[PDB]
Amino acid sequence: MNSIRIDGDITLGGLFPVHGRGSEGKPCGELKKEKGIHRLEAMLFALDRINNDPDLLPNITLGARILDTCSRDTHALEQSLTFVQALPERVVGVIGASGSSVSIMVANILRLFKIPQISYASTAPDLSDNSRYDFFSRVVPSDTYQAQAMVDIVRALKWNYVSTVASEGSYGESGVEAFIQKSREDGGVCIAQSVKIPREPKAGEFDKIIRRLLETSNARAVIIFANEDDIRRVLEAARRANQTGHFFWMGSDSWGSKIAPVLHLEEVAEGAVTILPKRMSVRGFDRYFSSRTLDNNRRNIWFAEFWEDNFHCKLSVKKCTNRERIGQDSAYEQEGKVQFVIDAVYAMGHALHAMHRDLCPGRVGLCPRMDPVDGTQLLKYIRNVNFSGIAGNPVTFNENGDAPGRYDIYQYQLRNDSAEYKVIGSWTDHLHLRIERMHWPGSGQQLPRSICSLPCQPGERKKTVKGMPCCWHCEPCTGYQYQVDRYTCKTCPYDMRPTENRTGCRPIPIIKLEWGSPWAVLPLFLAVVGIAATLFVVITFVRYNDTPIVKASGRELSYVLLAGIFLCYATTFLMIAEPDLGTCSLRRIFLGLGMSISYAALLTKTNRIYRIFEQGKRSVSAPRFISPASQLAITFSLISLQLLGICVWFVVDPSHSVVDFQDQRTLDPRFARGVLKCDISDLSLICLLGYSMLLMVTCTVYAIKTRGVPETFNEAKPIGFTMYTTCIVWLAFIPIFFGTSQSADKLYIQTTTLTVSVSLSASVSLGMLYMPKVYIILFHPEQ
């Protein structure tokens, strides 16, 4: 008997907590005016409209059987069965079951018979699970839509390093898990940390929460899914911790726009951003509802109780006049969920209007298919509704029966100190925010950002922090490297040095041997003195070519020797000149060649003297090769082989100029130089000295024998000293050329010692063998 029946062809089921819980075994308490009877009447309000509406179920009466949950799952459930005991009225499909704790039981029972449910009030995600509540639907969004809005906002504020804070319990945990996973899925935001507030927090835990939030202190953003007191206590902790202006808060509808959680914490909460459910009142309902007196709603069997509590009066505390009107004789306002009670009723109405056009097309009353009116079909027709709801706001369901997310976005601001929440914008599965109208205590109108780290300068690398793509370690680039990518730089093989920003490389300066330097001036001078000294000598031998003193010297050999001395000097300074073919055609070849010829000709003269004694090991005849022509033939044989070694080496090591950065190489190229030289290998010294040093050894084998040789051969004395002397020069050479190879300085030492050695072999022969006689030749040609 305790229920409302509206007669009709199609009977709608419905449920409201018209009472709260009773006690001591009684199921039903006080009347929930607003959550109960206000919603209940909104159901009948929409029901009357449906029956009156020419577009839905034409001339078919949507009756209803409506029920009172008393906010108890067992009482709500035991009366809900009556729809199935009637499988009495055909209860085709059902509205409501109010909040979640009751909606799980009505969702449990009605799916057992493939009967659909449309809740106007239950929000919990635990009903989005089609494996258990396949027949469930709601016309209100779940809590997880705030999480998407939160992710969207954190991105809108360009934050990427945030902390998430929430209470224990499904509200907090749901918001957090939806937030974290949606944040991960959208990207752009990394979470510095995730912290919970216990169902029973310990004293000081909130200060500990702040300290933990400060372990990642640049994570100035805090996301909250916690209740009013938890919010208040976090803010108190920030106050106590003096983090006012450091932390900025974001949070759920549990904060909403209530001033309650921020009282005496106004300065702490300022700038906080909260997500509020979007709703409007239905004006049509208030106009209707506010006109209902006892006699205008007698079909509602609980209306009398509503009157007794509404007006604080008794109908059988003051005796009631039975004339009081709500909104005049008692305050009245509409419950926001009235909006969804009406949309739930209409969504059923629309789905029934889909079974009508398909299974009973254009009829009045119910076709045979509509005698069962299979709720397995009504279920698809509900999920597929798409219509403007009572608020004008489209009513749809996703595949789990969830309505799209509709929220307002507010920021807590202090306007002349006033504790107000201002609208920044809104979210309708997408943001619309006037960010420029936002305020933050640590910045005023400027947007603070909760971020990982700071950008690197060109030439510095942003190395990803493992596990957090948003974050980086800034690692400067070094050595001879240049930037490649934001987190990469690489080396330039080189003869090129990095530029100042290390984002590119440029060329290393090259040196040649310039005639002002110590290593160019010494041999430049020596080559010039060489020729002047040489011509003093040559000139006396040429002008007195036919006199007794020149002839006595072995004029023919003296000519080859003197010519080779001159010729090597003539080009000595060129071997260190800026490299080109006019020098790379000479290399150590030409100078080496005159030196080698000088030694061979000294050897030929030496053999002319000492052959009479050495020949004795093989023959007892007159020294072979005595005629001057034959002495020249030896002079020539000894050297023509050098020309052949030269010809081969020329092909092996080509006549070209090279820049070798290696000779002045550094680890830091900004201090590096390179060197311009003719491209000549060390093997060229074997090609030369491998034989000229043997002419020497041969000469010294003979020179040491002077002790037993007749005085007309005293000309040997200076050949001997010359060769000993130049041996010493070449013994001095190897420790300088090779003994210095470990040092960069070889670039001038090697080239200098070589050009100088040429002048020395040449100068020593003149100084010992010719000049002591030139004085005499010049003034006494007959001696």
Next chain:
Amino acid sequence: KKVLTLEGDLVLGGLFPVHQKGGPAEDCGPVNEHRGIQRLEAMLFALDRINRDPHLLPGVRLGAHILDSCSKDTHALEQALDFVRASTAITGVIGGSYSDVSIQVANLLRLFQIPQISYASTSAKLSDKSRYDYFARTVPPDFFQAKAMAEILRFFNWTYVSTVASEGDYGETGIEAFELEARARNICVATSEKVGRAMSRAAFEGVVRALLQKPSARVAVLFTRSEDARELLAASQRLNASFTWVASDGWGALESVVAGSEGAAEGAITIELASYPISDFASYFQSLDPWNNSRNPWFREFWEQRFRCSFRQRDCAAHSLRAVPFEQESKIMFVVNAVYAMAHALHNMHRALCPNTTRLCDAMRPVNGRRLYKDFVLNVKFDAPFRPADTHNEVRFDRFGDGIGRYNIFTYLRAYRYQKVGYWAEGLTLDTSLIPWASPSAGPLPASRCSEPCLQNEVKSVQPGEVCCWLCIPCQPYEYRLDEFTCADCGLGYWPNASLTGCFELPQEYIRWGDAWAVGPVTIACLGALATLFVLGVFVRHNATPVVKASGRELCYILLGGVFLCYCMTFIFIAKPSTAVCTLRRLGLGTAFSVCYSALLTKTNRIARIFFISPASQVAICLALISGQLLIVVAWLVVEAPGTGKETAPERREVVTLRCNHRDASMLGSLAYNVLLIALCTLYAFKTRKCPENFNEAKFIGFTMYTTCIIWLAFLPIFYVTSSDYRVQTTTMCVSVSLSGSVVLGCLFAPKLHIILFQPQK
């Protein structure tokens, strides 16, 4: 239409397939005897037995309220409401028949958590207590039959097979388990078919025609369909069809699918829950009088379906169910367990709430099924009614309310009947001597296996078959196997490792490389030089001819120039290849110029002149010719370099070898037109002998020339190909060089050697 109701000091209702599924109309089908009525009647006797039992709640007449499911879930769902309509309030559902009834009812009952214990729903679906937190069973999960099936298939090496399951959970949970168990034993399901709850006769044949698409899979697995006991009769057709059926406990020791449907060929295997018959329940059932059994409101209609004399007719029920043969349905033991189990949990619930009194209060009889389930049902310990001492059947529950996972294995035999051939209890045991497939006497054993299992050297090839069906083909000796679908390979020098996971760089051929063969033939060539030497070391003391100090010393030196050049170079050799060896060993095969001709050209120019003459003239001439020969062959390295220090025959890859081959015919271009005038010179020189020296050496020179030309030339018929193969190359080169040179020598040196060596006075 009709319901069974009893008074009771407690009421513990039940639900059965008393009727089978009827037609499309909202009505019921014929009585199910075995799985229907016998089970129902067992419950009635079990209640009488518990009511009379002097230990089990003796102070109470327990009653029941028993529903007919009619095998339609909508009917069962509506009828089952009687248990909750009072919220009579009924203290726990026994049975619920087969799975989708038990599941839609264990679904139905959840709203109030009404307790439920089943004897015939087996699907794992109800093992998840997050959806069914009150529901217990006396039967094991169905995935144990999937193990049994896979194991039986694996037994007969049946690696490839076909199956049929139904819509409704028995199908999906059964087939998914069996597929995983099939995969776990390498069993390739050839195909699987899904049957509805209302499938036509033509569609039953359609499924058979689908199963006949690869007669090579002789085995066809049956997962209860909706209920095989009725429905398989429509598929076990004799219309040119046969299989070796393997069925779940929807079929087990039943005539109801073979009589008139011979497609259920001998050898079909049925898996049933392990059980025992009870003579006290059989006695009750077989003794029932259709006139007196008013407690069962269907028994008289069952009699009309079993006997043709309807209770509406005269002189009927003269027969009896004991007078005619019958069999006890296999699950009766589980039914009575489910009856006792519900009673035991409620005996302890009664004692727990009210131990001083006969009965529950009407405020207590809303027994919460989750309260009862977790604290009372799962803790029931009671031996199965009338159980023999040789079994272990009980009403004890597992942690999920599961029963006992032990099955019987029956084989369908002709003279038609069933016999137990084995069992399964986490492992398969068969006595195959009772199965027509043991020691086959009429052709081979049943085939249901797609390919041989592959060897580790073979790759999956030829046969996708239906699926998973691969033969494998061996990899080549030189190929390995990084994929069991395809053989891997490597370059020359690279050959399969024993693991077949990679390649080894092969060894060298090596033989007498490290222990270089070269030192032997080299030493033997040096014996020429030494024999020569000790002879020259005494010669004028023993064979006078003192021109030997000049002429003889230089003539021998001329030859050994050659001998040396020769052996020195060829024995730069194939030890340690590339290196100091590769550049200077072959040089276009120009070593016969080193010996025979160095020797002969110069000894010729020397004698020509004799018949500038000096020791130096002899040294100088041979050196000029040596430098000319040497320089033009080595000068081909102005173009070329040492290389080809790696090859092998693809037709081997047994070893690597390191043979240099630097445009050899182009390198022969160093000399290719000229050596024939050296041969002609030789032939002239042969002719010029006008002044024969002491011992007539001019004759020995002519003799040399003739035979030497030969010995030398003789090598190239050997070398030109066989120089490619180690043992012949090495042996023939070593001896060739040694020998040919020795001919040159022996020919002119032997007189001087043997004269002094054997007659030192001469």
